[PDB]
Design a protein around this nucleic acid. Structure first.
Lengths: 139, 162, 181, 180
RNA sequence: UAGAAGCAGCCAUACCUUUAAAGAGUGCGUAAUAGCUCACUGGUCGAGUACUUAAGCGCCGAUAAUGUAACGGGGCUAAAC
């Protein structure tokens, strides 16, 4: 069993054992530098600077298993459509358009962390996230 | 204020009846304390195994089974019980249930395979039992065992004249 | 079909004091006129009227049975005291049960429209539509769902899905009932 | 009325119950308890069980239904299993000790409190900061535990005082919680 | 915004999925989470319950200075309506 469960967001290609990583790793007796090295090794194949979510389970035997899932969907959509800062009035002030093909590709890519059984359902989850961020749905 | 409840209950009964008529084999599991993640993983495993597991109202399920000629002990419906219909791999479903019972507190309260009300012991035996392909492989191995023994004995006897 | 039937019996009191006594006995004085007949003075059970026609409009039509005859009547008027929720007179306009007739009927808007969702402007050009039917089949109100109506879309009168024996009567069939710009 | 008033009363084998002339006697392994029952309610012992009903349907009788059902139930559970309510003494220098049929409490006051224990009730210690009152009557047990708690009611700044074990004390802050 | 991880604050929550059922979260409380709870739904139990409307009597609101002192008194659960 895992003694501690930690959920964090990390900068892909920039995983270092600074204050944040040390605070995350020290509470559960987990090697913060080892976790940072594993995160860098995993996120080398990820976009540099991308905030990849990380779920870490630290057992009683001091071992920690840390998995970096698909990065934030809001971050991925903002990168795709050139969105850096989320539009405040996401209901009216559209920040951009989320293309149908781009949404389908993003949903297929992030289907690992999405619990849907249909590609249409995954694309709908992506589109709902885009609407919540304020991105106008692509027709 | 009661027609709407009647309509919702009728729709639930119809969906449950469709599942019960589509499922060749059925089982009921008491999953009290089975966490959200554990339930999601168990449902994913059942879906991969082709079974459909879902929570069904005890009274509605009992009425539907009484209509459909399912004469099981009501103790199976006693307790929050997810009904899982498996039509192809009953051994696989039982093995998955046993694995969940090992890795969590879920219990296989009742079972119904070929209209046979399987109690705790019968359900455990069925779950430990393997599938049809594995059974064929085991029967083939058992049948070939005498042939392999005879061939080995003949080889040893022939060598013993060296 | 019962829920459109109403039991009455004749009254011969005809006074303010008499009407007050009737309403104390928990009934409603009422009169029926139309079709050139002599006016019929009758009384109605208040509990029955409340139970059945708690939502009556100008276009509601119903059946009066005095045990010996049937009448098809509109609720032409109803004198209501708002403070005490008290009906204290009913006017029933009779019509012929088999004569086609016209009547403006209001619309009821349902659903959330995609256009208004995305920045459309509701403009309810028409609050009612002239329809045509026999009295017993007149629609109380005609429904309209806006959900598929996207931006820059107007609603044609033919687009209104209508009850079975109800038919449009507008001279301008192509006028728009509600627009979303 | 409501289902507690009509819910039947099971009788343990070791426990005997008897009803007569507006009185009930319940004799068990650990003692004997008595109760008055009002005229409007009738109590019956049949088939090793106790049932209660009402001759009338006035609201006094409605309430009495449940009241006497519950009392007789607690009257039977006591004679079989006895009632016990426990307490904890928390705080610097607070102590409790026992001598015979009385308890001595050190609770910060300039006098050491003696406490006569009423008859029919026993007191059990666990070290010098844990108490448990046991007895035949739930009413008496609650009374004693309450009066002991009143000897030094708890406080919210540090949890000091005499608390019911099941109780949860809402807690405030003092100096350093207001830190800016 | 510095934080806002459901709970300073802006916007909707036409955000989807596994859906039994889970709200862009009901409250408590954390700089920020964290943490504890609820709507929500499942099992044990086994009929009325939950919100309102109109009337007949009632409750609190009710509160000055020589002495009970706002039934004439005694008293009255009718000897009240």
């Amino acid at each position: 069993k895992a003694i501690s469960w930690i959920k964090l967001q990390v900068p892909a290609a920039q995983a270092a054992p600074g204050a944040k990583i040390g605070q995350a790793l020290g509470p559960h007796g987990v090697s913060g530098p080892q976790f940072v090295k594993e995160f860098n090794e995993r996120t080398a194949k990820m976009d540099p600077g991308i905030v990849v979510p990380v779920i870490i389970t630290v057992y009683s035997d001091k071992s920690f298993s840390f998995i970096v899932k698909t990065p934030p969907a809001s971050i991925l959509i903002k990168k795709a459509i050139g969105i850096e800062s989320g539009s405040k009035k996401s209901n009216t002030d559209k920040v951009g358009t989320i293309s149908k093909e781009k949404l389908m590709e993003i949903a297929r890519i992030k289907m690992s962390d999405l619990n849907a059984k249909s590609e249409s359902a995954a694309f709908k989850i992506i589109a709902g996230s885009a609407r919540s961020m304020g991105v106008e749905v692509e027709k | 204020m009661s027609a709407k409840i009647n309509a919702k209950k009728l729709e639930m009964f119809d969906l449950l009846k469709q599942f019960i008529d589509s499922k060749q084999n059925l089982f009921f599991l008491d999953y009290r304390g089975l966490n959200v993640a554990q339930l999601t993983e168990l449902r994913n495993k059942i879906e991969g195994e082709h079974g459909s597991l879902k929570v069904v109202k005890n009274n509605i399920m009992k009425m539907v089974l009484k209509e459909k000629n399912i004469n099981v002990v009501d103790s199976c419906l006693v307790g929050p019980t997810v009904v899982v219909t498996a039509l192809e791999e009953a051994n696989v479903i039982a093995k998955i249930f046993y694995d969940f019972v090992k890795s969590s507190t879920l219990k296989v309260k009742g079972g119904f395979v070929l209209g046979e009300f399987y109690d705790e012991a019968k359900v455990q035996a069925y779950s430990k039992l393997p599938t049809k392909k594995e059974s064929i492989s085991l029967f083939a191995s058992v049948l070939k065992a005498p042939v392999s023994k005879l061939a080995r004995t003949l080889k040893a006897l022939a060598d013993v004249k060296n | 079909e019962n829920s459109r039937v109403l039991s009455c019996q004749y009254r011969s009191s005809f006074g303010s004091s008499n009407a007050r006594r009737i309403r104390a006995k928990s009934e409603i004085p009422a009169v029926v006129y139309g079709q050139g007949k002599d006016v019929s003075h009758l009384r109605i059970k208040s509990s029955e009227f409340n139970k059945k026609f708690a939502k009556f409009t100008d276009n509601t039509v119903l059946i009066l049975d005095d045990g010996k005859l049937e009448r098809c009547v509109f609720v032409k008027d109803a004198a209501e005291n708002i403070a005490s929720k008290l009906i204290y007179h009913i006017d029933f306009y009779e019509v012929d049960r088999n004569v086609e007739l016209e009547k403006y009927v209001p619309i009821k808007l349902i659903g959330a429209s995609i256009g208004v969702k995305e920045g459309g402007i509701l403009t309810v050009l028409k609050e009612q539509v002239k329809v045509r039917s026999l009295p017993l089949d007149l629609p109380e109100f005609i429904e309209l769902d806006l959900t598929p109506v996207n931006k820059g879309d107007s609603v044609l009168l033919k687009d209104l899905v209508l009850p079975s024996n109800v038919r449009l009567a507008e001279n301008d069939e192509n006028l728009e009932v509600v627009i979303i710009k | 009325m409501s289902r507690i008033g009509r819910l039947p009363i099971k009788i343990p084998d070791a426990v005997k119950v008897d009803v007569k002339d507006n009185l009930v006697i319940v004799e068990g392994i650990r003692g004997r308890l008595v109760q008055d029952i009002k005229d409007s309610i009738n109590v019956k012992v049949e088939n090793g069980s106790v049932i209660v009903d009402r001759v009338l349907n006035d609201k006094k009788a409605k309430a009495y239904h449940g009241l006497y059902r519950s009392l007789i139930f607690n009257m039977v559970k006591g004679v079989t299993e006895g009632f016990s309510k426990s307490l904890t003494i928390n705080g610097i220098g607070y102590r409790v000790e026992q001598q015979g049929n009385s308890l001595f409490l050190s609770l910060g006051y300039s006098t050491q409190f003696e406490y006569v224990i009423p008859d029919g009730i026993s007191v059990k210690l666990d070290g010098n900061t844990k108490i448990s009152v046991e007895g035949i009557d739930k009413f008496k047990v609650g009374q004693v535990a309450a009066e002991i708690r009143s000897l030094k009611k708890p406080e919210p700044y540090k949890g000091k005082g005499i608390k019911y074990d099941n109780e949860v004390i809402r807690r405030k802050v003092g100096k350093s919680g207001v830190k800016k």
